[model samples]
Target: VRTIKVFTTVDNINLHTQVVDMSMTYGQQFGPTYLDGADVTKIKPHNSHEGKTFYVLPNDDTLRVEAFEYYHTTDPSFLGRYMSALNHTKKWKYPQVNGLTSIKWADNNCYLATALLTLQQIELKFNPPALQDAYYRARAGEAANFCALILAYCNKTVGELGDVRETMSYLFQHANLDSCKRVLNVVCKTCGQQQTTLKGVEAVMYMGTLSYEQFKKGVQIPCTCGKQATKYLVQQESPFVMMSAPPAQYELKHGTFTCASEYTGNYQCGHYKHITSKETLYCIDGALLTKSSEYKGPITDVFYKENSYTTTIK
Candidate 1:
């Protein structure tokens, strides 16, 4: 099993006292030697100090071990599904839907896609009666937050629990080239950013229809606090989606939640629209994976660079 380690400074006053050490046990996810300043929100920003880091070991002969840090979940079945996926696959393959690839994890759409897949599987699998009731009672507190936590854990790392829109956008960009367009073209628009694309526009329209149903069914009883409760409500939930949206929104509803998201037209969060049409448009361009090809990737040059791991703040 591979492990991840994270280090941080508590405060400027007593730099050493501010330090927090954390680690996780993962199998075969190669990554950094030590993650430093992993806590982006060290303040009271949604249990920021409670941040976590996962040490990842490489899958086979990969360059670096992939790692992540984040919050946890409450749903039993959902949590199980996440752990199951992790138990099944160490390195998650990004999503490729309808013959067109999209970031499914480790970066952009893939992250959301992977979580969605876990939830979908959970719904299909058997749901224990006890956990079902606990799920309902814990609805307000767990819902999306719970599911998000479980989903986050299944991956190489668990992101700190909180609103992750901005941070996700940045991570998707820096991690991989294909992911850049996935964020700017797909996720941002889904979250209601102005940068639009044909696919993004269609998705927004579809998810919005779903949000309304989430409000109608999830929040059957109105809270003293004025907000439409739902089982789940990602910004992407559209009114057009029918029943799926409602249930999903209810599930996605933050534990003691608020707001569907910018993915929806809801002004509570930011609005995204298609700003550009150009995706990164990646192609091997006749590139070969052959071991003997002149440009068979990585081995093209011999004076290879020295590799080492170091921690840096995001």
Candidate 2:
């Protein structure tokens, strides 16, 4: 029942004319609007624009030649879902993705106008059948997930569509704190520079993963300590030992006449050894990995104090 207003603009440099106006009907229900007496009464099912036209409204009313402008209306809820979904895709750079280009700068530029134009280009190049479905579903608290699914389907070939949709459906149903943890860990690989536990999870969700609901619910996820290093090791069995040669001693042998007393013999020796031992030794001291407490319930928690949004290096 909720309604949204739509508007359009024309680029007529040669005529030095630029007309920005609104369309009375729901934009989606009506396709194009005309300025200079273009008869739309007979145009039951709107027509697609001939060349270089953008599809804004649900309807396809063609703009009349020499008179350039189009407008339409739609459900405000539907528009919100689409806008929410659009937020996720903003990370995608222009031109890299087909049909999408950077927002043109203009002092008098309208945000809605720029968005509609960009969406039109996307619709033209990658018209996924499930796009509208995704938009509608996205309104039910799954905008980020649906956006990723929409983009995934848009980028994949027809042959792979079935599998992609199947996987997406499974993900939608199975979103939870545990699943969020796994998905985020995999996506982020490592915690670069973040304090909160959901830092990586937030980034993963922003990128493509769902589980926004879980994040909002304040799930206690793990914080990253990166790779840990061993601090010390204690010895168990061997202790300490010392060994040395003993001092030399003198000896006498029997004699015939020169030295009768030499017949008697005497000998002496000195030697000593010391040893230390232990049974077992283990690491008793080492640096510990630290982590902050669970996040406060809400996506706008203090986790994003430094950064506007949670992001990972990946």
Candidate 3:
């Protein structure tokens, strides 16, 4: 859908001009990266038929026009049906529908098509629960600051976590074209007592919505220890982080006790551990899978390039 996005700037008057990106109509999705100074200047301003003013970022490449000669949608077409049936359409696929394509950076950043990547993931794996829904299911204090923590994890790097994958630098440059990457969900327990981790479906199930100022600051998770535990979302292969619970044991011994069950309590002097105290980021450190092409559909063509541009503009 075509729409006009008005940019109202409180400062930087010169950067106020609106940019109308035609590529938005094509399937490219450009994001916050476009706000970079260099790209903004590259966006040539021009007037239209009525001498109406607008901005244009040009690319005349036109192959998609041919591939789109036919239109298709299965009765259960595109997984959109399940989205509709569940009324989750509004939240996930439909509204930001175009973003599912390859998301690109204005400069040279790694390429990824999360929407398609996610779809491939779902086709081969189960669709993970929504973070918000998971947030609602979380135990007290475990769910606090849900959004900020996950958002921070996405921007974090292996290097930041303290090591770099030597291969990724090489593979990233040469376009290890065949080295397709996938993500697995992971949750790391923070309490430091039991200090458990949750992986796969369970990790995602309790995963919180992506956060507040987490770059330098840590968010606290409610620990059975009666103190706050730190949460970390790391990309470790597999789910040793997985959950296994037995009823709690207690003390008045809070310990005084539960009528039934045991307090799995990480049980340190101040310790409580529950799977709910976890957070998530879909881990991308996955080993190479087959080209995303195995799915075989126009949507799954698995473009050689995933530059973020949107064919539709607001």
Candidate 4:
């Protein structure tokens, strides 16, 4: 009787399945890559059990899990990029994980890494290797906001959250302008657009922040040379308005300055020889207010103005 008795025991684990945004915030909770799969299995809820809801097992080849691994692999690109720009930025090394998708570490960087990848898919552009290498040139113009959004998920009150909010607001206002509408329509016509992808969602997100019908109509303001670019007035009629207004003058409430991609990072009101004698997106000045910059001010005076840029654009 002692010879051949074998007991096979299977543990029945009770697990509940919950629908998550699975977008950024939820995805961000998972640690960075380089964490052991076993370690993550012991910690994460749904993945912790077998025969349970959405069980992410040790050997399973699941989509989300794989994506997690992918994110952790290169999150430093995201972190390093921000650090270069904002400073005081924290860094996280990847965690150890056995499975392809198991994550080992997480922080603001991890989430941003995931987002930038998603934006790459959304923007339908080839991966740019590094955040800095590709971000400034990526089609994901909204990349900054998405990056900020991920940061906001963790640092809710981190003073800089307003930067994210303002960026989105400025973009929405830009997209709604009559000048912008034609551009959107033309892009759809030429780009063979699809309305379902993340790119579509981003477009919707941008539009969600706009009020086309409620916004003021475009009016032609007379300049010294009698040349007029479309503008909406701040006060009903301020004839004393000077040509070189402060950055605040550019606000939607003020005169016309047709939205120009509410760019982020520090900006200054200077001249770029390439883009225009007026404004350069790369300049640290203009209609946008960024943290710790010389161009910081209200949107009203900064919006519309003719400045000069000496920087050569290649």
Candidate 5:
């Protein structure tokens, strides 16, 4: 007997079950409308043999044994939508059975097992006019829902692949900061539940280059200390001194004092008066030899008067 069979892989077992449940529910709600105009009563399971499930409706148009006949009966757009959904399913990571999960044999294999079952149930429930009406409505609604599911499924698949970080990084690399920001904003606008605050392009530019704390503090001017001239630390006392007497003199041992006395003769004052007065001096080899102090006045006369001038020493 001609029939569609379900042969899903272990990983897709859950998917198979989900499809079955969803198809059957849709089938039950709208199946009767595919009967053209003839229908009376409830639909029930017609047969189950060797775990190959089947449902029979009087003159079922949903599932046709002949390939040409089935394609002619089904809406091309519906087939198109179904193929799109199946393609998305195929993109999943898990392996699926050959020929079974594909649309190439939709006519002979009734699309997927769930699709065939749904058609069978539909035929069983509706008559000619009602079935015809259901067929039209079914195609429109099915196409709409298929598109929606494709979007949802694709998103789910992307999440499963764990490539979001990679994709985000890739985009950041290819695009500039402003474009990247717009792209992020677009994604958030489409998919976000509420509002999303993504990192700004300017901020993202600094992510790996600077620490989070540094970025938060804001961009700063680079320090120019590297280009500055060196400053040497020096230790020295002030050269200035407070004047307490004439000549602003500081007392010192063996210090020379200026004398006004002139060396007139060989005879000099008995001995140089170290105690008070200064004598004269002879320049020999830039050395001053004291000669006499008899002509010397008080040391006060030789020194400049403090009242004569006022100066601050450094």
Candidate 6:
């Protein structure tokens, strides 16, 4: 049943009013009351419209009709006092699923404002809707990054994202500071080769070019203290799937056998180790490096800061 109200105002005063309390099931139009009961006014000052009446078809009117239907139905008291906000600004016609529109669509009384303000536009005016409304199939790491990029680059009505979705889908599905930047920053360091953050697309290309495991070690930044950068112990820090073993309760050398010499051998031997003509023993703060099979394992090799070395547990 189509029951509607029409009111006419002249000079801000309610000049006349009419009520069409009838049910029209199909295409029909009733001229205001009779001569000029209440004529249909299509345009509203500066801003935007509706549906079965405004020319929207069924099935397609779900978003708008259902959304506003939900709002007013729940709180008819707020029919006019609520905030009117259009959060997503993608320049395409909404009312269809583009992520943003799914939040809600009340097609009836849709609005379009065209007023200009000399007032300074303080900042970009739109927020990318919830992460779900903007991306699909992307995991939290990547989808979160995608939504952030959309916020940064496509918050405008004219902004729309594309292969970038394909860009991140493949980039991240294959893989957040948009995240690739984050991933690259981490991997680049261990694999060696100082990196300044890369763009989403640049990271995409570099990732395929170098099969992460194939990043080939070499620190572009140099202190050329020598083996510290080129040593095997330095390059392939052990890889593991679980805490199957304790990670060397005593590991990552910060202390070492800093002092050991021929002349001091007699004195040190009394304290820790003795020196042979060809070799001098090492330590963990003076517990001879090769004196026992206890110093190694997760402790693979000792660091040089202490002039130290390691022994095998097995």
Top candidate, metric lDDT:
4
In candidate 6, which residue ranges exceed 4 Å CA deviation? Answer: 1-129, 136-152, 155-210, 216-314
lDDT of 3 by residue, 176-224 (tens): 1222222222223543333344333332222221121130133455666
Per-model TM values vs. the true structure? 0.18, 0.17, 0.19, 0.22, 0.14, 0.19
Whichever of 3 and 4 has more lDDT, that candidate is 4
RMSD of each: 22.8, 32.6, 23.3, 18.5, 45.1, 25.6
* lDDT, candidates in the order shown: 0.25, 0.24, 0.23, 0.26, 0.23, 0.22
| C-alpha lDDT (0 to 100) for residue 264 of candidate 1 | 26
lDDT (tens digit, per residue) of candidate 2 on 1-314: 33323233221211322222223342334344332223232232222332222223232223232122210122323322333334444333222112222222222111211222222321121123234444444333233333444433333221121221233233323222232221222213354433323322232223211223333333333435555311111111111000111112212111100100000111222111100011211110001111222211111000011112233323
Task: Give the TM-score comparing model 2 with the true structure, all chains together.
Answer: 0.17
Evaluated with TM-score, which candidate comes out highest? 4
TM-score of predicted structure 5? 0.14
Q: What lDDT tens digits, residue by residue, belong to model 6 across residues 1-314? A: 44444432211122234333344311233221111111232222111111112211112234334433322222222211111112232212322221112111122111111000000010111122232232431221122222232333322221221221222222232222133221222223235543243433343232111112223332222234432322111121211000111123222211232111111112112111111111222222211123332232222111111111121211
Which sequence of candidate numbers ranks them by lDDT, best first? 4, 1, 2, 5, 3, 6
Deviation (Å) of 134 in candidate 3: 25
> On TM-score, who's better, 1 or 6?
6
Query: Who is ahead in TM-score, 2 or 3?
Result: 3
Error of 2 at 109 (Å): 25
| Candidate 6: Cα lDDT at 190 | 38
The Cα RMSD of model 1 versus the native structure comes to 22.8
Residue lDDT tens for model 1, 1-314: 32223322111111211223323211112222112212132222122424444222222222111111111123223323433333323343423332222222332232333223222212122123322332343233323322333343333334322222332222222222221111111212123222322222232222233234333333232223543322322233221211122212222222221112212233243221110011221111111111111111111001001112111211
List runs of model 5 lying over 4 Å from the truth.
8-11, 15-213, 216-314
